[PDB]
Amino acid sequence: GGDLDISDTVGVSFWLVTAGMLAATVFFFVERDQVSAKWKTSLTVSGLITGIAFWHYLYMRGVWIDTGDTPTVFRYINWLLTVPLQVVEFYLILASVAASLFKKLLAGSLVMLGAGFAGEAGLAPVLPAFIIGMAGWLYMIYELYMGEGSPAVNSAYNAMMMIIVVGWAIYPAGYAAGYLMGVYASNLNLIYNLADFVNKILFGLIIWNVAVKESSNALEH
Amino acid sequence: GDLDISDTVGVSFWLVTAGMLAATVFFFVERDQVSAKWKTSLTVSGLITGIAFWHYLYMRGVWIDTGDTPTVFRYINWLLTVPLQVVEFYLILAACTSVAASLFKKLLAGSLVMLGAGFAGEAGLAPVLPAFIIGMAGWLYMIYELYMGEGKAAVSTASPAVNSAYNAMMMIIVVGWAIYPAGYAAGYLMGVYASNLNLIYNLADFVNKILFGLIIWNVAVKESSNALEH
Amino acid sequence: GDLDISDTVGVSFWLVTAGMLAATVFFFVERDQVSAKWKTSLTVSGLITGIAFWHYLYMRGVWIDTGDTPTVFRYINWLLTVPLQVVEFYLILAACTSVAASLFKKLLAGSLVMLGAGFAGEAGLAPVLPAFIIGMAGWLYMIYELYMGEGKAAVSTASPAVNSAYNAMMMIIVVGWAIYPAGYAAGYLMGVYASNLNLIYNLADFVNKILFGLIIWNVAVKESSNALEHHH
Amino acid sequence: GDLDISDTVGVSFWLVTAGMLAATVFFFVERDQVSAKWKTSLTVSGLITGIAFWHYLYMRGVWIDTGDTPTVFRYINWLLTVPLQVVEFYLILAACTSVAASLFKKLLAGSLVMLGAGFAGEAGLAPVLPAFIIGMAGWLYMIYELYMGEGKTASPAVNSAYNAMMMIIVVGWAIYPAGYAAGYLMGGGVYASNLNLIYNLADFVNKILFGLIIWNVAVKESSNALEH
Amino acid sequence: GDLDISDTVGVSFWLVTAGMLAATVFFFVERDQVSAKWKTSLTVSGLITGIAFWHYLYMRGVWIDTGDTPTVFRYINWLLTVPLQVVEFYLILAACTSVAASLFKKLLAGSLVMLGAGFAGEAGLAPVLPAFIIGMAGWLYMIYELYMGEGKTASPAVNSAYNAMMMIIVVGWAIYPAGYAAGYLMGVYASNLNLIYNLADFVNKILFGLIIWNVAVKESSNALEH
């Protein structure tokens, strides 16, 4: 019944990103009619990612406010549901040898989240778990750069390259800051929240920008 | 607060509820990536996943409040969605043989018996093994009538798309649907293993409601896009 | 807790609540499969199931919380929805005759006499038998106008597809609708059996509101399809 | 608990609430049945009816809960919807007269005097007779400006929509001051039942039915203009 | 109970909440009344009012359970909304200059200094006058960059939407500092503050969003004769 606790920096970013995702989810669904059939399914999936995110952010934030405990299970369940979706996006803008890419990328992301989970969950020591984490991460990055092998599809893929490399780096940076020093619960949750924001929203926005440029270029011809 | 990952059925319920909700949204929104011929399939898919969603919230509620198996919601959900899947089957069958309406009635009859028997088992309104067998009768009657009884009238190869669909519906009613009796056996024919029951029931709905849905959407999008040259 | 299987009236309420939800969605979405001629009819069918949904939620609430028959919720729900079905005749007949509004008025007055007499009986405002009779009178006056009165005049000047719609709709009011007075009869004219009464009413609501919508859906999807072919 | 049929007013709220819900969906969904000329006006018809729905839920809570007139919810709802109604009036004048801009401003001025007055009367901030009389003055001021003053047609739909407007702001709108008379100016305790039953009728007529008329006109012009 | 009318700001919150509910609906629904060209602009417009709506609902529970100014919910709304308003300024700006992305960043920094200052004052994190001066400075730095800095015209709809931006950020936004002045710089006057912030949200989100709607439907209708 009161105002937000400004002293609760973690409750505030939980709030902001909740909203971020809801705005996002709406933006992506409604803007579908400013891209052609070529791009529309991409946009749907962007919306599902941000929308599924939104519901768990609701649920995570309440867990903070009622207990101040880190919502690890809610956080990885969210990632378990959205990462594959982000990876389907890759397959989707390639549909070459794209179904093998999909299967490899998926298995490696499931490894990255299983490793990471086991650590935060106390099912494995914290540093080895991180390493297997990175293994599956870097294994994904490897198959994009080294593995395989229109101008719109290019600028679309390139941006995906960057986000998996540069963007995604915030998450293992978050895991590190929380568990790999001196648990640093606040720092973790801020970096994860910050990571979810950049990666689920900016990713969807890049697709959108490309889709709209292209849908517009094609509409004169 | 946090999900209790020790609650494996707990988690499974959460995952599938999300999948049904996401899939529901995906079937409805994507109606516009397919032609008039396919849109109603998308609607029915979305409806099937929609009803599942609301019943999955309820089913999780009971599992978590009490740790009992939500048999009634489970079977109520099936009662509502199985007929609609059978309708999806009829839609496909109407494209490729002039015997589709008769079949719809038989499938429906099969499906009601399958479910009524199964329910008797779990509700303890009849012994588990006879009930299973009777239910299996219903299931197989459907498979029979579809491929060896009246369904013995010709398929049509005319449309490669409708072939794809026809093949999917087969895979699902033969292979797909087989996951549910697996669940029942595992829960009731060993020596009640509540977890295994629900874990497998939950995987089956995922496969049979979402994955079936997606295969139809794929075929639908592919045929709709090809058509757009001609 | 799990739905109580042993409360079968409760389960029927759940089932129809869901059916109503589902059909509501189905009619609204499916409007993009019909031409401008039929779209509003599907908007109206959607509203019927939509109002029914909301009202089925309170009706169920009531039964499960107290065990009483939601008689006012029921009649109020029918009062809001019956006139929208009747509008449906006006909608599909408005272009091809001027008597559409005359008919409509007649059908409505029939429908209100029918509903009012039923309520009176079930609410204890009149004996159950006399109410049932005046109720039936109302119902039968609707069927008269539909078969051999103003409704017969108005449908002659009409296309095949509007004819297939009209007749299908009329037949649902002859045979489909009979489940309702049957339910009343089951409840109030025997040696009150609330269980049989809410069971049959539930069944009646399920069948009639969905099927009426599906008929209009079916004709329209067919006429609309045919119309895009014979103009291309 | 089943609805209480003896609560006439509480049944009245239930029904109208339900009508507003229905109507909001109707007007929004139906926009694809009208041409660009008419869509926004259907949108405004959904907003009025949508905003009325939410307030009717609240209005009925208050009645069921306390048995008292929900005056503030009533006038707040009217505060939000009446300018929207006056917006729909302006759009119609936009196609007709050549000075819709000024009329709108004047019509908006009347409506606010009207509601202000009405509210003072009911909230007990002013005697109920002068309150009524000032209220009436505002209303009549709007009517004057439409028929005799600054409001003094080359299309059949604009002709129907303009006339629809000219009729409703008199015969339709007249139900409200009637209901206020009924409630405060007959046996001066207050007659809450009559007051609320009559407003509930008036919101019904003026939000839903008048909305159905614009829909009807629009669905006709659009389909006719669809050839050629 | 009936809504409490003695509580003026109480019903001010009620009214504006509702305006945002309605305007959100207006702007999405009316997208089919404008061309691709304007569609995104309206989306950003409903987003602004949608977020606001959800925040006002919360703001109003706070005023009512406690009678306290909901400073946190308010500035949290602005943090979400203002950047979104600045992206609408960028789309308008891209159409009438080569320099629009450099402007988006300067205006966004401008706007965050504007908001953090104000918050610091209201939150009690910093004396109320020097935060006001710093906050003004972020605003005026935006106005500087637009008028007489790196902002120095195409079709008549682009010029309309341009001019609306140039007016709102001067006269429209001005209503916000006026409220803070009214509340913290006179002798905390919490009613006038909240009444004026409510009016400012109404003008700059609903009214300004409405101006853009207007430009877009006309231009969308004109261009349609070809």
Ligand SMILES: *C/C=C(C)/C=C/C=C(C)/C=C/C1=C(C)CCCC1(C)C
């Ligand atoms: C929508 C969420 C996304 C795209 C999440 C991506 C998360 C990662 C790439 C996490 C990576 C991690 C490591 C590479 C090492 C340790 C465990 C992590 C999970 C946090």
Ligand SMILES: *C/C=C(C)/C=C/C=C(C)/C=C/C1=C(C)CCCC1(C)C
């Ligand atoms: C959406 C739900 C669907 C398509 C469910 C299908 C369920 C079955 C095919 C269940 C079959 C069963 C048997 C064949 C044996 C006895 C009872 C069963 C229900 C588990």
Ligand SMILES: *C/C=C(C)/C=C/C=C(C)/C=C/C1=C(C)CCCC1(C)C
């Ligand atoms: C959507 C609901 C509908 C169309 C309900 C229709 C109900 C009737 C036609 C009821 C008829 C009755 C009689 C003819 C006898 C008196 C009692 C009845 C009301 C249930």
Ligand SMILES: *C/C=C(C)/C=C/C=C(C)/C=C/C1=C(C)CCCC1(C)C
């Ligand atoms: C959607 C509601 C509308 C368009 C309501 C209109 C209400 C009025 C025009 C009420 C008028 C009254 C007077 C003219 C006399 C004083 C009392 C009244 C306010 C109720």
Ligand SMILES: *C/C=C(C)/C=C/C=C(C)/C=C/C1=C(C)CCCC1(C)C
């Ligand atoms: C949707 C909300 C908007 C556009 C809010 C804008 C708010 C401002 C421009 C506030 C400005 C202020 C100053 C310029 C001085 C410092 C204190 C203020 C923050 C309230």
